[PDB]
Each structure stands twice: as C-alpha cells, then as structure tokens.
Amino acid sequence: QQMETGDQRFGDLVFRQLAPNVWQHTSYLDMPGFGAVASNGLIVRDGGRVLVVDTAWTDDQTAQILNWIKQEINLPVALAVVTHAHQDKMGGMDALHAAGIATYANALSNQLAPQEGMVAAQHSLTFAANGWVEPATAPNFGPLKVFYPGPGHTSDNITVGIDGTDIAFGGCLIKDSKAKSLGNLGDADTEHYAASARAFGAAFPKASMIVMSHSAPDSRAAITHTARMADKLRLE
Ligand SMILES: C[C@H](S)C(=O)NCC(=O)O
Ligand SMILES: [Zn+2]
Ligand SMILES: [Zn+2]
C-alpha cells in the first residue's frame, strides 16, 4: 500500500527504497510508556542474494520482513547483521534463525544480549583498534562495510556502510539534525559518544545519506549535530 511520501506499507510494516538495491524497513512498537516508536533497518540486494541489517521489534514483524523480501525481491537471504543488543535491533532473532538465516553481531552485543533480554546472534564480529571489522569475522558481506565507532548509544553499537551507494547506517548512534536530545541514555557512554559520532562520519566520508534507527534518512548534518549534542552532554 503506497502512501504520500512514497513509502509502501506492508501490513504493520513500512518499506521505503533508498537506492536501486537498498531498502529501509520500518516496524512499530507501542512502547511502555511512550507510544508507537518506529525503528529502521536495511535490506540490501547483492546479486542473487539479500542482506539484512537489524531485525524488527518482534519475531512476527521480522517474519513479515522476510515475507516482503520473498514477495517483492524473491531472493534467498544470505545473512543478517544486527547493530546492537536492544529490542528494536535484535527483537526478532528467532524469526531469522527459524528461517535458517545466518546472523552476525558484535561480540560484545552477543555477550550483552542475555542481560538485555535478547537472543544472541549465531556469529560474533570483532574489530581492529581503528574500528574496522576483522574481515575474517565478517565473511562474504558483499557491499557491507561494518565499523565499530566506539562507545556511544551503547558500549556495543556498530555501524554499516554500503559500497556502490552513498548510504551509511548510523543506527541509534546518530540522531537526525532536528533532534533536541539524544534519547535513551541508559546504556550510553556520555564521555565517548561525541568521539564515536565523529569517528563514524570519518569512517564513511563519502556517505551523503545517513540512515538512522528512529528518523527518516538525513544528511551528514545529522552526524555533526549529534556529536555537537553529545559534546554538550559531556560538558555537563
Ligand atoms: C530511544 C531508544 S533508541 C528507542 O527507541 N528504543 C530503545 C530500545 O529498543 O530498547
Ligand atoms: Zn538501542
Ligand atoms: Zn533504540
């Protein structure tokens, strides 16, 4: 079902295409106590296979994503990468595993997952001192370039860039350019957030479209605005 802003709504989910081979999947959870909070992930068509970034809030919603891919793209999903251990990102792991999809996550995310009430991914990504993922730990990721910017939204948020496009996924590290706060600061590293935000921008300097978890895709203005807000917080 197409809407005003060019977003196709598919059941309780919403899908928007960002590039010839990149879609953004959006799911909603009526959050206690807040309201209906949106969460964004990515779907990437890489040849004869599909790559998924982040699940939905629930197993059923993630299964709905899988149905959409089967219906709209019709290609086997090779792998999934989840960006950190919160429900909006890892709430539908069982749906992926029941579908036989190999799942990947930061080793710290997999370690933190039980405490965060999550199901861990099946494989662990580790990272070099400069932030880039060990290539041996992220095999055949195609156009996906995974980067750990340091502690920000959580101690474990990783970010993904997509080769061939100008799209980088900041996840819940980056907020939009009109955000007046940084949101859920429960697991946040207020001391290193700003550094992490700028590190992300430096990792993908040629990315002009920044996709984030809870807002529509923004420009690089979101990165500098986030880091600026993170500075204000750190300076008390
Ligand atoms: C404000 C934060 S980033 C949110 O929307 N959800 C946090 C969570 O999924 O646990
Ligand atoms: Zn989170
Ligand atoms: Zn979140």
UniProtKB/Swiss-Prot annotation:
<keyword id="KW-0862">Zinc</keyword>
<dbReference type="GO" id="GO:0042597">
    <property type="term" value="C:periplasmic space"/>
</dbReference>
<keyword id="KW-0479">Metal-binding</keyword>
<dbReference type="GO" id="GO:0046677">
    <property type="term" value="P:response to antibiotic"/>
</dbReference>
<feature type="binding site">
    <location>
        <position position="214"/>
    </location>
    <ligand>
        <name>Zn(2+) 2</name>
    </ligand>
</feature>
<dbReference type="InterPro" id="IPR036866">
    <property type="entry name" value="RibonucZ/Hydroxyglut_hydro"/>
</dbReference>
<dbReference type="GO" id="GO:0017001">
    <property type="term" value="P:antibiotic catabolic process"/>
</dbReference>
<feature type="binding site">
    <location>
        <position position="175"/>
    </location>
    <ligand>
        <name>substrate</name>
    </ligand>
</feature>
<feature type="binding site">
    <location>
        <position position="153"/>
    </location>
    <ligand>
        <name>Zn(2+) 1</name>
    </ligand>
</feature>
<comment type="subunit">
    <text>Monomer.</text>
</comment>
<keyword id="KW-0732">Signal</keyword>
<dbReference type="InterPro" id="IPR050855">
    <property type="entry name" value="NDM-1-like"/>
</dbReference>
<keyword id="KW-0378">Hydrolase</keyword>
<feature type="binding site">
    <location>
        <position position="184"/>
    </location>
    <ligand>
        <name>substrate</name>
    </ligand>
</feature>
<feature type="binding site">
    <location>
        <position position="86"/>
    </location>
    <ligand>
        <name>Zn(2+) 1</name>
    </ligand>
</feature>
<dbReference type="GO" id="GO:0008800">
    <property type="term" value="F:beta-lactamase activity"/>
</dbReference>
<protein>
    <recommendedName>
        <fullName>Metallo-beta-lactamase type 2</fullName>
        <ecNumber>3.5.2.6</ecNumber>
    </recommendedName>
</protein>
<feature type="binding site">
    <location>
        <position position="172"/>
    </location>
    <ligand>
        <name>Zn(2+) 2</name>
    </ligand>
</feature>
<feature type="binding site">
    <location>
        <position position="88"/>
    </location>
    <ligand>
        <name>Zn(2+) 2</name>
    </ligand>
</feature>
<keyword id="KW-0614">Plasmid</keyword>
<dbReference type="GO" id="GO:0008270">
    <property type="term" value="F:zinc ion binding"/>
</dbReference>
<feature type="binding site">
    <location>
        <position position="84"/>
    </location>
    <ligand>
        <name>Zn(2+) 1</name>
    </ligand>
</feature>
<keyword id="KW-0574">Periplasm</keyword>
<comment type="function">
    <text>Confers resistance to the different beta-lactams antibiotics (penicillin, cephalosporin and carbapenem) via the hydrolysis of the beta-lactam ring. Does not confer resistance to the polymixin colistin or the fluoroquinolone ciprofloxacin.</text>
</comment>
<dbReference type="Pfam" id="PF00753">
    <property type="entry name" value="Lactamase_B"/>
</dbReference>
<dbReference type="InterPro" id="IPR001279">
    <property type="entry name" value="Metallo-B-lactamas"/>
</dbReference>
<comment type="similarity">
    <text>Belongs to the metallo-beta-lactamase superfamily. Class-B beta-lactamase family.</text>
</comment>
<keyword id="KW-0046">Antibiotic resistance</keyword>
